[PDB]
Amino acid sequence: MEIKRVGSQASGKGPADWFTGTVRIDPLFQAPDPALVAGHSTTFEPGARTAWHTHPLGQTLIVTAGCGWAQREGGAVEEIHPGDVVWFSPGEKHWHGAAPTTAMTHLAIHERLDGKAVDWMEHVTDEQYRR
């Protein structure tokens, strides 16, 4: 049994390669072998969002605060709210982040496949960032 107490993990920032705007990453866990799951919290300032990317075994999002936007390639831009659970499929190309006037926070959970849980791709343009 191991307990990581609230406040004991330092907050970080989202690398400018992988996010447009100001984004905070709050780590939570990464199960050790032979389990593969990891997770963390991510807070997006208004207008901020991930770049396009995919996950090798998909990813689950549990929105925990605010109001955000998300979109897979070919899909419409959807608004997401606290309590909504979002599932992206393996290899599914997508982004997510805040809405233009409100931040958003969600818990993200994904399994690692031989070490890897993400593949980053191009930024979401201001033309894409609209609804």
Q: Residues annotated as binding site?
A: 53, 55, 59, 94, 96
Q: Does 11 bind a second copy (CB under 8 A)?
A: no
Please answer whether residues 80 and 70 qualify as being in contact, where contact means their C-beta atoms are separated by less than 8 angstroms: yes
Which residue in the block uniquely carries the two structure tokens 């605060």? 65
Is residue 109 a contact point for a second copy (CB under 8 A)?
Answer: yes
Would you tell me how many other CB atoms lie within 10 Å of the CB of residue 68? 28
| Using rule CB under 5 A, residue 41 touches Mn ion | no
- Closest approach of Mn ion to the CB of residue 53, in Å: 6
Question: Does residue 78 belong to the site contacting a second copy (CB under 8 A)?
Answer: yes
**Member of 48, 51, 86, 124 binding a second copy (CB under 8 A):** 86
Give whole-number Cα distances, 28 to 36, 48, 86, 93, in Å: 14, 21, 19, 24
* Site for Mn ion, rule CB under 5 A: 59
